[PDB]
Amino acid sequence: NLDIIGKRIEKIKQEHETSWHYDQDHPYKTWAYHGSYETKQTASSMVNGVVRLLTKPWDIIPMVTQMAMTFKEKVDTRTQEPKEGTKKLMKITAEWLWKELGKKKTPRMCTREEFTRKVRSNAALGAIFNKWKSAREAVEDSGFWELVDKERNLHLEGKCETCVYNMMSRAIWYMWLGARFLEFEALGFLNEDHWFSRENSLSGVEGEGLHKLGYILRDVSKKEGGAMYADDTAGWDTRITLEDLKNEEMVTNHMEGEHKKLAEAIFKLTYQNKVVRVQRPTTVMDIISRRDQRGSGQVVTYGLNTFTNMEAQLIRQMEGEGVFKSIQHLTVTEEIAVKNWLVRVGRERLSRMAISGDDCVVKPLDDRFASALTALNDMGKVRKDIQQWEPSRGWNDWTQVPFCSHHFHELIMKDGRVLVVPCRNQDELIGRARISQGAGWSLRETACLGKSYAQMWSLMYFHRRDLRLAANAICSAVPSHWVPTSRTTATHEWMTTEDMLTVWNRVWIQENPWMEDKTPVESWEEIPYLGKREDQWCGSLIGLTSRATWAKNIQTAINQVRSLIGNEEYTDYMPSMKRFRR
Numbered sequence: 001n002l003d004i005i006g007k008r009i010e011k012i013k014q015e016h017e018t019s020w021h022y023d024q025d026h027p028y029k030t031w032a033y034h035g036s037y038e039t040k041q042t043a044s045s046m047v048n049g050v051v052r053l054l055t056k057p058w059d060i061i062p063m064v065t066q067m068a069m070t071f072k073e074k075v076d077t078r079t080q081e082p083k084e085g086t087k088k089l090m091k092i093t094a095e096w097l098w099k100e101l102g103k104k105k106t107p108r109m110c111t112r113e114e115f116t117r118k119v120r121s122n123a124a125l126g127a128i129f130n131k132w133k134s135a136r137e138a139v140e141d142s143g144f145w146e147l148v149d150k151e152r153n154l155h156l157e158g159k160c161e162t163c164v165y166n167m168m169s170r171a172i173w174y175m176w177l178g179a180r181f182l183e184f185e186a187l188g189f190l191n192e193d194h195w196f197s198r199e200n201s202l203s204g205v206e207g208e209g210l211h212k213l214g215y216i217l218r219d220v221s222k223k224e225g226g227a228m229y230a231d232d233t234a235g236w237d238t239r240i241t242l243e244d245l246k247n248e249e250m251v252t253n254h255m256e257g258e259h260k261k262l263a264e265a266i267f268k269l270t271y272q273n274k275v276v277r278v279q280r281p282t283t284v285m286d287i288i289s290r291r292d293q294r295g296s297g298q299v300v301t302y303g304l305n306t307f308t309n310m311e312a313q314l315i316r317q318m319e320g321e322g323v324f325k326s327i328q329h330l331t332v333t334e335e336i337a338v339k340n341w342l343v344r345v346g347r348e349r350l351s352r353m354a355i356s357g358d359d360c361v362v363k364p365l366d367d368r369f370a371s372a373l374t375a376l377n378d379m380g381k382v383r384k385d386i387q388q389w390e391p392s393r394g395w396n397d398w399t400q401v402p403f404c405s406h407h408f409h410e411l412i413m414k415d416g417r418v419l420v421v422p423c424r425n426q427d428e429l430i431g432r433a434r435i436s437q438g439a440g441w442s443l444r445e446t447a448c449l450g451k452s453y454a455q456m457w458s459l460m461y462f463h464r465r466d467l468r469l470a471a472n473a474i475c476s477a478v479p480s481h482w483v484p485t486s487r488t489t490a491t492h493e494w495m496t497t498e499d500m501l502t503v504w505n506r507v508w509i510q511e512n513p514w515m516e517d518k519t520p521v522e523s524w525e526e527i528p529y530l531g532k533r534e535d536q537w538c539g540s541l542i543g544l545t546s547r548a549t550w551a552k553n554i555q556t557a558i559n560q561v562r563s564l565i566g567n568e569e570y571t572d573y574m575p576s577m578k579r580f581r582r
């Protein structure tokens with residue numbers, strides 16, 4: 001308690017000595033409360049005019065237009081201590097899983113140099129605005145690194161002064177760049193050295209890319225076993241227990257010297273004890289603490305969510321296979337059975353899963369898994385939108401399974417080769433491309449963001465009639481040489497000025513390990529669509545009068561946007577499609 005967090009608390013107390021007060025009408029039950037101080041400030045979603053002008057038919061579709069308009073009573077809930085059988089299963093499984101992940105990897109510190117390179121190419125490293133303007137400025141000034149140094153030596157001394165969270169089914173915890181560096185130094189290796197790659201973790205998909213996820217699910221489908229299960233957890237980050245945080249910390253067992261001590265301090269001082277500042281309109285700032293739940297960097301959050309989800313799902317698999325009888329207590333011989341299952345079949349069982357943070361797909365040995373719920377519920381990983389003890393409903397066809405907000409189609413090219421393509425409801429794709437975040441966007445910057453969405457559609461969603469047409473229109477309306485941009489950056493092969501057919505050939509043919517015949521495609525007309533009825537099922541407007549008029553008159557829409565941007569060099573990409581080719 002207050003020995004580990006007191007210093008951070010004491011320090012903030014004094015910067016607002018003229019405003020401190022223990023409020024008696026504080027709304028926290030599960031968060032420990034400490035005091036308040038005076039503040040007064042808030043970032044809504046803005047429309048991308050280039051994309052909206054080239055998607056007119058969607059101006060009258062509420063599922064699109066409502067996306068651009070406009071639970072913190074889950075962060076304030078509590079999770080019970082698991083039983084001794086559950087705690088034992090998790091500790092054995094975690095111990096075994098860090099060793100497998102560590103067999104072909106070496107833990108190591110990430111460097112000021114690596115951190116600097118990140119900030120100078122815009123990665124979302126959740127920092128704050130004070131002393132320096134942006135992240136870019138702090139990194140070049142040696143004053144910063146002295147602040148970093150002071151805290152660093154403080155962590156080696158087992159103490160913390162400035163690693164404090166700021167709060168803002170989503171909840172983001174911005175720290176100051178200094179605390180973010182120290183997190184990156186100790187734990188960045190998990191992401192930087194791809195510990196959750198499929199090659200390394202067998203269940204993971206880190207670095208895999210949307211054009212690979214469908215092929216990975218089809219490979220899992222080829223295993224003998226039961227249905228494919230894809231149960232979502234209700235508020236995964238809120239259900240991370242202190243026992244979860246202690247099994248995650250065991251990665252330090254594989255470290256040495258300084259690194260081991262630096263990593264131990266991050267886990268002890270910032271993860272297993274937290275200090276947070278929250279905006280309350282009644283507007284004051286609340287300084288609240290708690291020991292459990294996830295509140296880390298988004299990138300470290302991803303890897304440890306993947307880790308603990310892999311652990312939970314292997315245990316749910318053990319329960320289905322009858323490896324242990326009850327979570328109340330493991331007998332001595334159940335421990336050796338669990339250990340022996342892991343050594344004997346653990347790697348096979350990891351390969352039956354696709355896990356991306358809190359998101360999983362499992363193809364278990366048989367359907368006993370569906371009603372194996374005691375460990376899953378007792379670990380606190382309670383399923384969303386089903387009653388606690390109701391058996392899971394599985395999927396009989398890998399093409400129906402949801403994963404990373406998509407489903408996947410099997411699409412046969414006129415030449416017989418097989419594409420496995422990512423898909424989701426087309427209203428969601430159009431609605432997202434019509435939104436920008438933040439202020440001060442020039443027309444050129446807005447156009448270059450439209451171009452990023454268009455090239456993503458040409459590479460990932462070419463099989464959707466409306467998106468291939470809208471992508472060609474946007475690429476025709478934005479100057480040919482203007483570089484696609486994004487303010488918050490899987491593998492993003494569409495972020496390039498290279499010809500999109502050349503990039504399509506590299507991603508789907510040359511570099512695709514599921515495509516044996518490497519014959520290049522010579523034109524976009526060789527590249528197939530979904531069936532017309534399947535395209536409508538997945539949200540296409542093909543067949544509507546609005547869509548026909550848009551497609552026929554597309555050059556008029558392209559010319560409207562070209563006239564706004566002005567006298568620039570443009571390319572006509574519409575004749576790459578059969579219907580505009582004379």
Ligand SMILES: CCn1cnc2ccccc21
Pocket residue numbers: 319320367368371372373391
């Ligand atoms: C886990 C054991 N088991 C297997 N099949 C079931 C069906 C309902 C309840 C429990 C079941």
Ligand SMILES: [Zn+2]
Pocket residue numbers: 151155159160161162163179269
């Ligand atoms: Zn600290």
Ligand SMILES: [Zn+2]
Pocket residue numbers: 407409423424538
């Ligand atoms: Zn679809």
